[PDB]
Design a protein around this ligand. Sequence first.
Ligand SMILES: Nc1ncnc2c1ncn2[C@@H]1O[C@H](COP(=O)(O)OP(=O)(O)NP(=O)(O)O)[C@@H](O)[C@H]1O
Ligand SMILES: Nc1ncnc2c1ncn2[C@@H]1O[C@H](COP(=O)(O)OP(=O)(O)NP(=O)(O)O)[C@@H](O)[C@H]1O
Ligand SMILES: [Cl-]
Ligand SMILES: [Cl-]
Ligand SMILES: [K+]
Ligand SMILES: [K+]
Ligand SMILES: [Mg+2]
Ligand SMILES: [Mg+2]
Ligand code: NA
Ligand code: NA
Lengths: 384, 384
Amino acid sequence: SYDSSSIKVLKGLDAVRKRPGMYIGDTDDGTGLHHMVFEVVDNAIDEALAGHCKEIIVTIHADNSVSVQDDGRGIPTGIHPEEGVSAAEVIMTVLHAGGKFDDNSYKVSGGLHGVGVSVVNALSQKLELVIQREGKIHRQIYEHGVPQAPLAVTGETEKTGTMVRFWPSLETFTNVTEFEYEILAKRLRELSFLNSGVSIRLRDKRDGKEDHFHYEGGIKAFVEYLNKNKTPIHPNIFYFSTEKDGIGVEVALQWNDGFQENIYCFTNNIPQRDGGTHLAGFRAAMTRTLNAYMDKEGYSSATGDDAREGLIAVVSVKVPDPKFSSQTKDKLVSSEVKSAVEQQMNELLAEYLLENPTDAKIVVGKIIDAARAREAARRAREMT
Amino acid sequence: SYDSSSIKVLKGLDAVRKRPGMYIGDTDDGTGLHHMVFEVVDNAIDEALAGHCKEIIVTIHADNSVSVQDDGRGIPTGIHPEEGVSAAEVIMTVLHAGGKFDDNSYKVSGGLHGVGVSVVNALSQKLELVIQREGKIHRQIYEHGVPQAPLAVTGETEKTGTMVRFWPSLETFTNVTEFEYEILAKRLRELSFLNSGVSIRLRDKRDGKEDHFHYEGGIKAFVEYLNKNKTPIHPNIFYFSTEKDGIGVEVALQWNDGFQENIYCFTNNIPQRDGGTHLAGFRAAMTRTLNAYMDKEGYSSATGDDAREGLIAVVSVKVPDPKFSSQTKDKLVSSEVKSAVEQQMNELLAEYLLENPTDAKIVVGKIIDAARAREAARRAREMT
Ligand SMILES: Nc1ncnc2c1ncn2[C@@H]1O[C@H](COP(=O)(O)OP(=O)(O)NP(=O)(O)O)[C@@H](O)[C@H]1O
Ligand SMILES: Nc1ncnc2c1ncn2[C@@H]1O[C@H](COP(=O)(O)OP(=O)(O)NP(=O)(O)O)[C@@H](O)[C@H]1O
Ligand SMILES: [Cl-]
Ligand SMILES: [Cl-]
Ligand SMILES: [K+]
Ligand SMILES: [K+]
Ligand SMILES: [Mg+2]
Ligand SMILES: [Mg+2]
Ligand code: NA
Ligand code: NA
């Protein structure tokens, strides 16, 4: 019988547990599990982007929980007038609730959906929240998203910040259920490059391992680190940072003598594994600008792929209201960011090539050599 | 000032309009726009999977709206006791509300989130809903998701079905704002192959163009259609359909003399452009089974990629509760479907090769030739 009683409305966080795929991704291969940490980290990084957080401490506890402490402003603790409970509880228990739906609290933020930490809460057998703010320490415990008591003052403090510790639910997560130090370290190291001046610590209470990430030199240094084990073919890393028409575009890149292409794209410090409009705009501008240079200099045929070979690049955009295809933010689907990246790249890359002739001639040589190798491969295939 | 007044809860469908990327995808390149149609179509296809719908009519109207009519059971019209309005209105106005959170109404369905048509409604300047059910015709109009009046009986009928017509909001959709016949036709043709016995019609009132898709022969015929403009190298399409351990696995495939790999994956008739665990399980089983055969027959080194070359395959799984990484369902993230596909493929592909020696020897030859071409390409690159 298919009728009005067949229609069910999922309330609170029930939808997250029912359909975890669309909120956290793969609950079996470990990617979703670690994404739980990243949602919490991203919220602390947003306090850092806002200029309020200078230290983030991530700890893997010996009981397989993870905590993230920041020294930001603290999650608001006061009673939310409409909802009638602490704003912190609203944040933790309500989907599409948060402080990033305008630019008053965070001018630019990786967070935008009002979903992330409420997902972590929904999918955690236990979550502990400690907030330092307005001279007071506040604490609350959740179990499978359900607050055990209202947020309560437990003492006094001169400090501000938020600590979230969570124990993932094994009713949701399967197979890969332990946290992997290196997965967290990779992301935190990257975040240090992306946030100069923010101390990021990782501590593993299981074996005593720890790291302190506080790189200077930003995404240019990130490119150096990424080319460390490789062989850069020219010495001057191309770098710029601009802010035009509301959009920040920061790019660093350098070619090596290998044959892989590694372009790391970020939007408000969140990586897009699956690329997007920023990547599209980067590729379009590289192809145009190199072709223009080779034409002008009489080095001209090479395609976009030949320029890709041996390339390491970091593309980091800052966008007031970006659009991602999912909660996990693997792909940027904002057409105006393609235009911004493409335009800034076309201008500044052309200038780089004019200002650094030694590097330009090396890169042209590399593109030519890639095109020659591609044609030889093609001819060899045809002939078998 | 960052405090409890900074925290905002988005209600009703406001979150969909605020953050359309995570609900419909790209609102500028036309993919999201057409996805609006596909959400409505998928709901009608689910009535077909349930055995209640035998005809679906998709119409592109001259005012740039689209309608989808089905002859299924009809969206329930009775008052929802908890919500206090028609179940149809709950469906249209509430996220994570629907009839696919258990298997009582639809044993297997592409729909699972309780989100799709409410998104279409949220992002439409106008939506018209007409439901035929329990001897009555019911109608309701929405504007930007807001019902203009409660669902009302407008007359009598011996028929059942649902008609949704929507006019997309240009406050959300930009650039590509007109519907493209061929985009809809591709998907509807595919759905006809996937749903033998369901008549699917497409009509364009702008120019009078129409199609009637009612292919027989299922996914085997789909493979024929896909190889039509190519040159199959062996005559017997590998095909099976099984249902084991709660999971349906249906595969058809055939090699052609070209060099592309085209594997079309589906879960409950919804395509995964970005692949997933079904694709992973398919690839794993092809590699194992071909290698085993070549070893046994003394034809053995070829990798998984060499088997990929010239391959056309359709992989269609039927899953009680699949997991997708997003509302647009581009990627299947269900580890148990990898195991089911891999296991069924290993068994039945091995049998196919034993039963069809002429085809097996041709395919082995092709894999060998691909491996030879790959090595020649590699050697040619190294030598430049
Ligand atoms: N560490 C923190 N410090 C201060 N405020 C925080 C912190 N973590 C969360 N918040 C607040 O809680 C809100 C909700 O967080 P969350 O559910 O993660 O959604 P979001 O960050 O807004 N967006 P998203 O992560 O993309 O879903 C944020 O918008 C902030 O207002
Ligand atoms: N054409 C239809 N015929 C009958 N029932 C329908 C039809 N369209 C929608 N429904 C009902 O409306 C519910 C909500 O649809 P919708 O918001 O699209 O979510 P869903 O189909 O359940 N899941 P999803 O599409 O993955 O978000 C469905 O689960 C059905 O119960
Ligand atoms: Cl407050
Ligand atoms: Cl009813
Ligand atoms: K939230
Ligand atoms: K719905
Ligand atoms: Mg967040
Ligand atoms: Mg649906
Ligand atoms: Na914002
Ligand atoms: Na179901």
